[PDB]
Amino acid sequence: GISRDSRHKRSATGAKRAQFRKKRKFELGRQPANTKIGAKRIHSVRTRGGNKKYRALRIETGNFSWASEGISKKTRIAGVVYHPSNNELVRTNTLTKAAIVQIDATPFRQWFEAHYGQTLGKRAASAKIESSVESQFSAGRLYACISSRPGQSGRCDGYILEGEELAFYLRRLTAKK
Template identity: 40%
Template sequence: MQWQAESVRKVTGGRRRPAQNKRRAEIGRAPADTHIGENRTRIIRTYGGNNFVVALRANYANVTDPKSGDTKKAKIANVEKNTANPNYVRRNLLTKGAVIKTEIGSARITSRPGQDGVINAVLLE
């Protein structure tokens, strides 16, 4: 579990005395780490009783061609580049901004698989 409230320490290093204790709503969750593989999703109950889908594994992406505007479902081969973390390329992690190799060509992921549960990408030139 990750606690996502304000830090006890200020930027200056001084101590901040919290007015309240930790709350259930301030708990975060571990990253989804979406991999390439047979589709696997998880439904998570969020604060307020809503649900959203988290993609744990995926092997297809909705790839849009910016010139024609056509969107096709393409199989993901591997991750070519990821500016967020070079280690993600070796682990084949799918994150927003990652460049993936598909059967259509190289594409950049525009959605957030760990938040949206789907992989949308834009075809590169």
Template identity: 45%
Template sequence: MCISHDSMHKRLATGGKKKAWRKKRKYELGRQSANPKLSTNKTAVTRKTRILDVVYNASNSKLVRTQTLLKRAIDQVDAALFKQWYLQHYGLDIGRKSSSSQERRRGETGTEEAKKSNHVMRKLEKQQRYRGLVVGLHLFAA
């Protein structure tokens, strides 16, 4: 039994069965959907995200070409949700240039950030110990 993307197995509009007039073809073959969990090693936090592309797979390059998701495959994902979580968790906005360089170009004064309570500041300082990103990640997160 396999997952098939054809209409040969369906019934007619009248309710009768269709007669099989040929065998199944390879291009009609389907696969079970992958339910991957993506996370970082250090923080042990898992979030849902959108997978854009499979970049590398150590076991076989055909798996990259067919976009097959396996364990230890390197995937390209949508970074919007990760950046949002990182800003909330660590208080740092990744993927954007510093505000001072933008102010110099525009010649404007930037708006001040919302003041945070002492409790929030202590929590962010405590979480800074476990913060770790790959060097140059901001180049890819843009």
């Protein structure tokens, strides 16, 4: 089976030691959920004790926040455009923690214009929001960072990027483009 023992790595001396015991139950590693994007199908796992751990294998909708003014809504994801671990992962669009996604702009701009009254792009000081932010408002496609383990929580939480974060990720995309 799939274990997470140390009973196979080399010693710090640099030699191979003896086999100790048959591999147990508690030292187990379960099967990795390559969570794709789609019709949300959740699967429950009974872990040690009576603990329930959820693995959603697909999803459309995640919970996203701005701390720019502190709002958070459930929205529909659109796509996977960056992730620091694996280019193949980014390619086949299997979302993970710390993933960079394109997300819809529609309910957020609806709230913004229903809360301020000012059309995006095209409370005055708070209405002067960031220029790249309102450009992505005009584009209708925002950049978010999924910052939650999906294959543990069975949830998908993200926050839309801000200045230096958005700056480095834009630089990453423009260097990789």
